[PDB]
Write a protein that binds this DNA or RNA. Structure first.
Lengths: 133, 52, 48, 123, 125, 52, 94, 180
RNA sequence: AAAACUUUCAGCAACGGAUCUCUUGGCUCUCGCAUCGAUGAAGAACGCAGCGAAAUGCGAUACGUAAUGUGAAUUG
RNA sequence: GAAGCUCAGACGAGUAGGCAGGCGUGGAGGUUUGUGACGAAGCCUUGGGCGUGAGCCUGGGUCGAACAGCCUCUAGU
RNA sequence: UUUCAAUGGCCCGUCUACACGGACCAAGGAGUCUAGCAUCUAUGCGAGUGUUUGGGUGAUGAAAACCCAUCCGCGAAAUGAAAGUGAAUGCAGGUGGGAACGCCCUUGUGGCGUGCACCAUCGACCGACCCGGAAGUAUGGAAGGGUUUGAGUAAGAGCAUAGCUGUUGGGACCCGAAAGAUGGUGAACCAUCUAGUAGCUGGUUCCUGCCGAAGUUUCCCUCAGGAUAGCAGAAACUCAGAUCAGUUUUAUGAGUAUGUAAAAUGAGAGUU
RNA sequence: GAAGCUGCUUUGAGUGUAGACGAUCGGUCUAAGUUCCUUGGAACAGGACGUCAGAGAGGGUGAGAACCCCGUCUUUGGUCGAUUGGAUAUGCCAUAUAAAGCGCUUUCGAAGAGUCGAGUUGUUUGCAGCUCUAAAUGGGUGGUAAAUUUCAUCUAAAGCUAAAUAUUGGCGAGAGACCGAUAGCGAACAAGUAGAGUGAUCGAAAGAUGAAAAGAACUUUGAAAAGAGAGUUAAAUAGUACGUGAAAUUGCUGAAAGGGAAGCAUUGGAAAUCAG
């Protein structure tokens, strides 16, 4: 692949931004996002607030203030009622998921915000949605 | 404001309609690229159009 | 959020101003609008 | 919203000031200098630029400002040059020295062709 | 713009009703304007033409000529005026048709029925 | 040609509202108005509001 | 659209719905959850699954420790004990 | 053969003009008659409450209006239906009662009040019945305490064995009559 | 090693009625309405105009009479 | 015209078949202050030009009323 | 542009040298619409999703647009023939590995890790199957034992719309067979069903570029066929490798060749 | 429900007048340039200067007309008829010695037969032929049981009834991302016409002068058809074999080639003709 199949202008801006980041820095994180932003919709499965919470507070934790990054959708999981303070960056958050993060927790970011924050992707966990569907 | 609501509060004249939220926070990509948070980390820019 | 100035019948700027509605902050998606316009303009076609 | 999304809407495919041909595209827009469609010289998509255009024996200039760019009536202001082709050149480069210089080489060249009109029109 | 559901903007129907009209309606279609003086005299804009009406030709090659309608030729949508004639090739004379829209009434054939028609159109007799 | 060709086409109601909002927001960008062909070279303000 | 089709390129080329315990606390109005979950109140919330079109309450998931009464037609054989140590009660709808 | 739906906007507009013409014909009285509160008859829907055909003869007898007066003043009567649970008696009763309370009957023969029909007549107004008489759903309970006696009530003690008791009741009853 | 003849090219003229433009037509959709006859229907035949052969109109009162309306034609 | 500019290297038959980009036609929405009785469309042409090609622009003649470029939609293409 | 000279040039299409079609020109003329299903891509929303059966509104243009109502469909739970029961072991696991990142030792490398998707394994968790019957009101079920079972749970991912492609059915890419029925006319014919059976014959309309086989395999078959490969591909993901080879060599056993193993040699090599 | 008992409630199968309300027809009323210059046969074109707009839908007029015309908008209206819609008020008769509804019963309750049903044959449980043929808590129908039973629900063999619904016909309306004369109905015109078959039936071809017939006077040649001059036209390169007029195909003129073919391609020469 060399370009995204969508015609979304806002997605093409992300591709434009991250082409520069991948080819002007050596960060393999930027290359990873570029390869995953080119992917089709069914190759970019959703992720859940429950999964992200489990993946941060997992075993030895080691999450702290590391901002979780996923290229896809961050859906909510109503099966959990206690949501920890989280910092998440993604293409899009469902309306319920965004409210649950904001009202009791940390912050939501878009991918362009992440670049202005951690352009090398320093101290981030690059999760991926379940491809089993 | 009553018709279209907002991206955070439900529209008064459209039940459970929240304005869609942008995929990207800022659409001024050139200022992002030329920002100090990015230009300070980028490796030495390679040459533009070159001689044969 | 900025504000806009209302204008009068005579064409002068009125005293009052209104806050800019949140709708003007929505994304501008030419491709989605074209796809919807393609599929909405078909809804007043009489069969032949 | 922002300038890139404006360019991604109007610049690439549809504008009233754009002219496509067999494989080439030109910008008729009265505020562009090179006359051709790109992000660096787009009138509608970009912030303040400078151009010049003819009127009945003289030349006059268009500019923008960032604060007032939401009010199209005086978004552009007009300044007039009707004294000499050379003095126009010194005027034009002066009013763009404190401004980005990526346009002068197109701007200053545009002038002399417009002034060349008046000479050829006189002939 | 029409808003009544009872009239046609269709070219097909409008042309058929025009070219396929009776004589009692063709008379209405042959309405001609009044000249300024009688227009201000009667407060009327136009009337259907009648035989022996005194008119003036405004448009066409016969412009400026006056006369009286010797006969309104309703079927052909033409008006006929004396001394407005064409020299036949053999030597005869055959008048010409000037459409009712291109003439102007300079002197009516006033009559009782025409009096009520003028006063019925809010006019002054 | 049969009359029962598929003449009308469904669109998701939310997508319809999305596009209407986007066209409304697009009506407030003077660049978009000029490109579409409107003559707003001397309009006082986009958006333009007159009194009640 | 015919113009994109392949023909325009071949020219020449010839009754019991189920609810589990991880979902009862999602059936409340959000203000009921706000003011009744986790607070040591004398009176406990009541959940009528039948009003959400659910017949049998199965027992999959963990529970918050807030006491809550569940009204249901049928119930799985573990779903009741889990709400015992959850402090709430189960009583059966007729 | 092939049933097409190109008249769907047309048929919708026909009904609107049908309602508007009907309502304007009988403007004083409400366009829509009242209906009782009735429960759908099956285990899937029995919890819900919907509008039935008419009020049973028990309810008109209780409400104090004859089956003749009710038909004249816009109360439909259903003879087939019979109401057995006295709540269905109730819920329909005040439904008739409040309808009569808000009902205003114009006197016949030049506005001399007969019996208790009414005195005022300028209050003529055509109102939606579902506004003054909406049909509600079942009243659910909220925040009831204790019932720790139901705590010890360990569900299947009833369900599992009484279901088996019901299943084996016929065989059990046959057994008892056999050795007797 | 001409002319005639054949062939090719161009000009002009024939032949033919394509192309373009149009349109009182068709087709489709929707809406509205319910009205034949033994008190002689639908259909058919013969007649009726100043000169009509055509189409409609009409029935020995025969391209109609009575009445109402319009207001001054009809037309080759 | 980031869908852009630039440098370098190798390669080039092709049936069924797979893929991509284009040319042309009728009608629809938008746009070009678009062309036109001082001659639209069409038609002819030992006139000229463009494209690898589908095709396109133009000169002259005839003609007499409508027609086209661009971005999309559509199909009795 | 015409013509001349030299040089070359079998008449095109279709089937399999033929044969079959072609006197010439203009116009018409053949993969269409719809329903189901499936993949893929895109858009909206997301444990939800879909209001166009219906109601409101829109009279100035009104078959549109907009608003409201989720009964219901699909999804959220599986198993069993059915009664009926009905799914985090273990930071909703470990076991190894595994993405980027951090994380350095402050270079990086390497590691430290972390572990996403995952990946394989497994611990298990529910149903069925079998053995056992704590209890609790004949009834009845638990604890526990299987290495039998399920495109099972194990922190849901689907729903709607549009497009492309394939397939099934409707006349079904177009054209073409005798026939048969119904009802009529005349002493065989007519009109409808009919646009039939078509396993075939013929035809099937613009350009350029790119990739490009197969005839024999893999078996299976009642039949023609499919398979299946192979080839050509299309999408996802390992290792910078002994990871390969229509190849040679060396050693090695057995009676130049044989195989296995390894030196030469060229290439980024695998996959589901 | 009938028949006895009770006290409340009620009441027309009527008839003129006035006003309002709507339905339709019938008619009537509807704003503003035809002002100048250029082209043109014609201005409805271009330019200048204005006007109306609840009217800038559409059509006509000698070429793209909001203002020349018909119309369109106001119009869900003003007016004028005619009837009718039934309500409102009013006036007059009516007869009204009245009957009915509901508290109660001290009870009586009639209820559809060759029908239901069973067996049998046909056909798509339903119906039909055939033989038998019922009953009064009976009969039909089902959940149960059990193969019988309880239980539930309904009252067949008599009958009426608007609305939501259908509508390739008829008549009347409005439209179209439709067809544009080999298309669209077979039929845009003299179309179910001419015509064909004994008959049932079958069934075409055919649109376009011009703004106005101004449809070509007159002279001459010819018997005539026609020709040549003329004459009309903005135009006969519009003459009724009529807009535009393509190809196949034919004739004349000019050029060139050719000894049993030609056509085509590459390279140039010659002749013609362009181009920068």
């Amino acid at each position: 692949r060399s370009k995204p199949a969508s015609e979304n202008v806002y997605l093409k801006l992300l591709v434009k931004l991250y082409r520069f980041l991948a080819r002007r820095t050596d960060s393999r994180f930027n290359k990873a996002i570029l390869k995953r932003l080119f992917q089709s919709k069914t190759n970019r499965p959703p992720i859940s607030i429950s999964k992200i919470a489990a993946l941060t507070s997992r075993k030895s934790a080691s999450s702290q203030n590391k901002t979780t990054v996923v290229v896809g959708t961050v859906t909510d999981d109503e099966r959990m009622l206690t949501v920890p303070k989280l910092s998440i960056a993604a293409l899009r958050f469902t309306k319920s998921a965004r409210a649950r993060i904001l009202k009791a927790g940390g912050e939501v970011l878009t991918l362009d915000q992440l670049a202005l924050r951690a352009p090398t992707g320093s101290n981030t966990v690059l999760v991926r949605g379940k491809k089993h569907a | 404001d009553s018709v279209f609501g907002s991206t955070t509060e439900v529209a008064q004249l459209k039940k459970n309609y929240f304005l869609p939220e942008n995929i990207i926070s800022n659409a001024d990509v050139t200022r992002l690229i030329n920002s100090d948070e990015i230009q300070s980390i980028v490796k030495a820019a390679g040459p533009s159009r070159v001689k044969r | 959020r900025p504000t806009v100035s209302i204008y009068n019948k005579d064409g002068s700027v009125s005293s009052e101003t209104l806050a800019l509605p949140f709708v003007f902050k929505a994304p501008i998606r030419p491709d989605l609008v074209r796809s919807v316009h393609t599929a909405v303009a078909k809804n007043k076609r009489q069969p032949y | 919203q922002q300038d890139e999304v404006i360019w991604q809407v109007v610049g690439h495919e549809f504008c009233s000031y754009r002219i496509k041909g067999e494989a080439q595209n030109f910008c008729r827009n009265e505020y562009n200098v090179t006359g051709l469609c790109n992000r660096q010289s787009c009138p509608l998509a970009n912030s303040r630029y400078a151009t010049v255009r003819e009127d009945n024996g003289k030349l006059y200039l268009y500019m923008k400002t960032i604060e007032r760019a939401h009010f199209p009536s005086k978004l552009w202001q007009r300044i007039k040059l009707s004294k000499n082709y050379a003095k126009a050149l010194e005027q034009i480069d002066q009013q763009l020295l404190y401004w980005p210089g990526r346009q002068i080489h197109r701007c200053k060249q545009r002038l002399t062709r417009l002034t060349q009109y008046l000479l050829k029109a006189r002939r | 713009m029409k808003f009544s559901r009872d009239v046609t903007s269709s070219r097909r129907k409008q042309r058929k009703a025009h070219f396929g009209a009776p004589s009692s309606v063709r008379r209405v279609l042959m309405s001609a304007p009044l000249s300024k003086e009688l227009r201000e005299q009667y407060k009327i804009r136009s009337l259907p033409v009648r035989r022996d009406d005194q008119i003036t030709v405004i448009r066409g090659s016969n412009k400026g000529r006056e006369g009286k309608i010797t006969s309104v030729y309703r079927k052909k949508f033409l008006l006929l005026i004396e001394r407005v004639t064409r020299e036949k090739a053999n030597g005869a004379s055959a008048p010409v048709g000037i459409d009712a829209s291109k003439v102007v009434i300079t002197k009516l054939h006033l009559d009782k029925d025409r009096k009520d028609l003028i006063v019925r159109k809010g006019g002054k007799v | 040609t049969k009359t029962w060709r598929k003449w009308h086409v469904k669109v998701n109601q939310n997508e319809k509202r999305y596009a209407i909002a986007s066209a409304v927001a697009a009506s407030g960008v003077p660049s978009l108005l000029l490109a579409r062909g409107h003559r707003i070279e001397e309009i006082p303000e986009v958006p333009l509001v007159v009194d009640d | 659209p015919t113009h994109v089709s392949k023909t325009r390129k071949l020219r020449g080329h010839v009754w019991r719905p189920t609810v589990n315990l991880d979902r009862l606390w999602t059936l409340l109005p959000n203000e009921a959850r706000d003011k009744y979950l986790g607070k040591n109140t004398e009176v406990a919330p009541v959940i009528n699954v039948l009003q959400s079109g659910y017949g049998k309450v199965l027992g999959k998931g963990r529970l918050p420790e807030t006491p809550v009464i569940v009204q249901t037609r049928y119930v799985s054989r573990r779903a009741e004990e889990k709400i015992k140590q959850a402090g709430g009660v189960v009583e059966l709808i007729a | 053969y092939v049933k097409t739906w190109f008249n769907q906007p047309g048929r919708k507009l026909r009904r609107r003009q049908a309602r508007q013409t009907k309502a304007a014909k009988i403007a004083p009285r409400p366009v829509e008659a009242i209906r009782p509160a009735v429960k759908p008859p099956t285990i899937r829907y029995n919890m819900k409450v919907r509008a039935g055909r008419g009020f049973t003869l028990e309810e008109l007898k209780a409400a104090g209006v004859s089956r003749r007066v009710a038909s004249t003043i816009g109360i439909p009567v259903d003879h087939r239906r019979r109401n057995r649970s006295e709540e269905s008696l109730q819920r329909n009763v005040e439904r008739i009662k409040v309808y009569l309370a808000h009902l205003i009957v114009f006197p016949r023969k030049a506005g001399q009040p007969k019996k208790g029909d009414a005195t005022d007549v300028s209050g003529a107004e055509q109102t939606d019945v579902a506004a003054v008489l909406p049909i509600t759903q079942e009243a659910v309970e909220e925040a009831k305490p204790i019932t720790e006696e139901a705590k010890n009530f360990n569900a299947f003690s009833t369900l599992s064995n009484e279901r088996a008791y019901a299943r084996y009741a016929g065989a059990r009853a046959a057994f008892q009559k056999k050795r007797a």
